[PDB]
Amino acid sequence: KVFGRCELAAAMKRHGLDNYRGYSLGNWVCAAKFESNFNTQATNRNTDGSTDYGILQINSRWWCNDGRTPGSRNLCNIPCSALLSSDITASVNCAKKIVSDGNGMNAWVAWRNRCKGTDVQAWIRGCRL
Ligand SMILES: CC(=O)N[C@@H]1[C@@H](O)[C@H](O)[C@@H](CO)O[C@@H]1O
Numbered sequence: 331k332v333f334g335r336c337e338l339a340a341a342m343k344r345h346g347l348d349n350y351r352g353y354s355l356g357n358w359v360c361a362a363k364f365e366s367n368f369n370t371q372a373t374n375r376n377t378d379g380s381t382d383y384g385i386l387q388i389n390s391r392w393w394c395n396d397g398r399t400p401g402s403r404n405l406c407n408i409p410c411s412a413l414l415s416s417d418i419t420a421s422v423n424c425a426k427k428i429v430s431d432g433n434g435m436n437a438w439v440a441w442r443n444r445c446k447g448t449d450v451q452a453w454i455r456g457c458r459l
């Protein structure tokens with residue numbers, strides 16, 4: 331599923347991401363835009379052979395099991411394919427674990443490089459929440 335901007339903002343707000351660990355909703359929408367272009371089916375392979383999955387590009391090196399990243403962890407205790415669903419619940423629940431692990435949203439490279447220190451409220455402007 332390719333979400334609309336405001337559609338995803340509302341879905342994330344319903345799942346508890348607004349101000350989660352102090353990150354306002356626009357941070358999460360901005361990260362999704364630049365990680366996946368709002369597409370739940372996005373996948374990208376990393377140099378080390380791990381793969382990033384879903385709307386927030388969660389990495390199999392640490393967070394999910396895809397059966398082909400030897401020696402990796404599965405800290406969200408999910409198959410990576412669950413992160414590709416049109417229902418964002420599994421991605422949101424896993425993201426809550428990631429952002430709580432001490433490094434905040436810096437775990438998302440696109441957030442650090444393209445959202446951090448910008449007017450992220452712009453990503454939710456005009457949306458009915
Ligand atoms: C939280 C998470 O899994 N972030 C991943 C990061 O590990 C990976 O290096 C990057 C590659 O583009 O995509 C995402 O930012």
Ligand SMILES: [Cl-]
Binds near residue numbers: 354356357450454
């Ligand atoms: Cl915001």
Ligand SMILES: [Cl-]
Binds near residue numbers: 396397399402
């Ligand atoms: Cl594996």
Ligand SMILES: [Cl-]
Binds near residue numbers: 417
């Ligand atoms: Cl959903």
Ligand SMILES: [Cl-]
Binds near residue numbers: 433434435
């Ligand atoms: Cl933080």
Ligand code: NA
Binds near residue numbers: 390396
């Ligand atoms: Na893994």
